[PDB]
Write a protein that binds this ligand. Structure first.
Ligand SMILES: Oc1ccc2c(c1)sc1nncn12
Length: 347
């Protein structure tokens, strides 16, 4: 039967009640728009509505035109603000939160289809849920070399500007998504083992379908370097995207092999960065701080950029400089998911 540590992981990520609660925390109205009736049509219409809001934000047009565009969004994607006036979506940050909400609904839509029982199946439902992921998860020995390198990568690349929590590694799984090896660009140079964080609602989607580029209808300004798959070399930069809290302080972190090839190195946000590649295989947003190559090690022949991070001396002379690197590939065939960390956030 299923390892007890794998059963606990599946039970955790397949919990629809937890998805309901995360959605209610993001102000989505699960009473008016239940997760059972969630569709890709509803989400796509939501993205279309956020595009009009993006246009108002871009132009500095608040007031009544913004209020009308926001009502269309709240009609297409029901929210619960109780007795409060529904707030305007006014800042790029606010727009990003609504893109993240629709990205969460997309992975929950996948989860609701997958976390179904068949009468005829002789399997416990938990077992059926795991089989339906088409993704092997194997628990690793805490005395193993891999666990030691991954513990060090987690701790040594916790950024100094993310001092509101530490992370304790509760457990570690090897990930083997069916088909991901066969698809992967093994040929490409510059293969790095990099971080990705996501909300607890998203892991069924990510493990069963892999990391995916943003929806085509999503507002382009939601994406600092366009519609690719985003990774960090600093554990805490990625772990901030877990959105864990004091009350929900268990999250997951993913390590993937990312075939970066030649990076187009950029100093400032450019949502059209995908077009600027021109023969290059990835975008690298340069940070002020990064692990130094003197501390690099390998795991399964991928480079692990162990910290501590130090000043890169990179500055954007005409803009904000990223504190930390980020890596964007625009094709899932440049990603191979490899490890899944069960992380206790110490707030
Ligand atoms: O601009 C971004 C957006 C998302 C994102 C990063 C950079 S690095 C990372 N790790 N998990 C999620 N992410």
């Amino acid at each position: 039967s299923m390892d007890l540590r794998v059963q606990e992981l599946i039970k955790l990520i397949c919990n629809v009640q937890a998805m309901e609660e995360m959605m209610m925390e993001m102000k989505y109205n699960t009473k008016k728009a239940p997760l059972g009736k969630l569709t890709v049509a509803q989400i796509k219409a939501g993205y279309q509505s956020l595009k009009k809001i993006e246009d108002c934000i871009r132009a500095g047009q608040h007031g009544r035109a913004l209020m009308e565009a926001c009502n269309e969004f709240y009609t297409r994607i029901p929210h619960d603000f109780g007795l409060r006036t529904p707030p305007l979506i006014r800042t790029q940050k606010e727009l990003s939160e609504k893109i993240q909400l629709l990205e969460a609904l997309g992975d929950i839509e996948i989860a609701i289809k997958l976390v179904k029982t068949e009468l005829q199946s002789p399997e416990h439902p938990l077992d059926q849920h795991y089989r339906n992921l088409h993704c092997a998860l194997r628990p690793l020995d805490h005395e193993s070399y891999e666990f030691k390198v991954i513990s060090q990568y987690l701790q040594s690349t916790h950024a100094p500007t993310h001092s509101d929590y530490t992370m304790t590694l509760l457990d570690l799984f090897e990930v083997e998504k069916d088909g991901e090896k066969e698809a992967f660009r093994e040929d490409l140079h510059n293969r790095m083992l990099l971080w990705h964080g996501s909300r607890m609602s998203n892991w069924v989607g990510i493990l069963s379908h892999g990391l995916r580029i943003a929806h085509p209808e999503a507002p382009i300004t939601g994406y600092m370097f366009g519609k690719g798959i985003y990774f960090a070399d600093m554990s805490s930069k990625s772990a901030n995207y877990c959105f864990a809290s004091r009350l929900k302080n268990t999250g997951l972190l993913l390590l993937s092999e990312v075939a970066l090839g030649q990076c187009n190195e950029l100093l400032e946000a450019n949502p059209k960065a995908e077009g600027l590649l021109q023969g290059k295989h990835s975008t690298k947003g340069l940070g002020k701080m990064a692990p130094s190559s003197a501390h690099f090690v390998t795991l399964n022949g991928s480079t692990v950029p162990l910290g501590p991070a130090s000043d890169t001396g990179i500055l954007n002379p005409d803009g904000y400089t990223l504190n930390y690197n980020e890596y964007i590939v625009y094709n899932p065939n440049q990603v191979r998911m490899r490890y899944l960390l069960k992380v206790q956030f110490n707030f």
